[PDB]
Amino acid sequence: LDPQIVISGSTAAFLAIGRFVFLGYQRREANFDSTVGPKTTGATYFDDLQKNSTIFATNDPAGFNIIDVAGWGALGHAVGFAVLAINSLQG
């Protein structure tokens, strides 16, 4: 009934399942240039709080930024605490 085993195994499983098999299918939806590449053709402030500013660099061979880690880890935590919570009501 260890919380560390449930949560750690959960986040490990979801980071793995996002690492190896659902990477390319998530990267096929990066191509929105068919419909939107200029989200905002702007010059100044009030347009670049809305346009991209920084690019998170990855020396990762596949290219996980901190954002994908945050996402898959977040799903892992949600599911892990769901498992512990369903375990919580006296089995």
């Binding site: 449930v6 195994g9 959960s10 499983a13 793995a16 399942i17 190896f20 098999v21 659902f22 390319g24 299918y25 498992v83 375990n87 089995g91």
Partner: protein
């Protein structure tokens, strides 16, 4: 052209002839468009394989005497332990849920990346059938026909146990006992105004 589902009537134009299980069965004109038809072929074959597996499984469970398919998952809501052919299975509901999620997600993602492929080869052909692509068409026909039969049988399982609450082999046994005395007219829930 394996046949014609309604003698005399003309076949639909959008069904191509070289295709397994091409009986021309389409009243609703669901597959008139190409890409949708291809997706539907994929879905039909896959549902067929899963239906075969499920029906064979329930029949094996009841035929070797381990309860029905309905009380196989009984050990998880009411406290207990899973089994296999007379041996206990040391796992928890969440354990099998985790390994099922990971394994099925991996397998189905891998499959769902190679476009739409229905017949693989090489390492999903480990015994050496369907090599000449000649009788392979007939094997496709046999595959899809047995698959349709299995889907219908499984829908039968769901409805039958939803009506009478007994297992398949038990229902067949009692139906062979008294044929006119008990079938879906003695059901009492199938046809209401009896």
């Amino acid at each position: 052209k394996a046949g014609n589902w309604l003698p005399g009537s003309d076949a639909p134009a959008w069904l191509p002839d070289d295709l397994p299980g091409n009986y021309g069965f389409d009243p609703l004109s669901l597959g008139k468009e190409p890409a949708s038809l291809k997706r539907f072929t994929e879905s039909e074959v896959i549902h067929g394989r899963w239906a075969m597996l499920g029906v064979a499984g329930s029949l094996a469970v009841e035929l070797l005497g381990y309860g029905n398919w309905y009380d196989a998952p009984l050990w998880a809501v009411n406290g207990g332990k899973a089994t296999w052919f007379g041996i206990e299975v040391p796992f928890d509901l969440n354990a099998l849920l985790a390994f099922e999620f990971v394994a099925m997600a991996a397998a189905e993602g891998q499959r769902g990346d190679a476009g739409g492929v229905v017949y693989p080869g090489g390492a999903f052909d480990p015994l050496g059938f369907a090599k000449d692509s000649s009788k392979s068409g007939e094997l496709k026909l046999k595959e899809i026909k047995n698959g349709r039969l299995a889907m219908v049988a499984f829908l039968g399982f769901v409805a039958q146990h939803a009506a009478t609450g007994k297992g398949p082999i038990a229902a067949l046994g009692e139906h062979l006992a008294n044929p006119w005395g008990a079938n879906f007219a003695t059901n009492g829930i199938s046809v209401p105004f009896f």
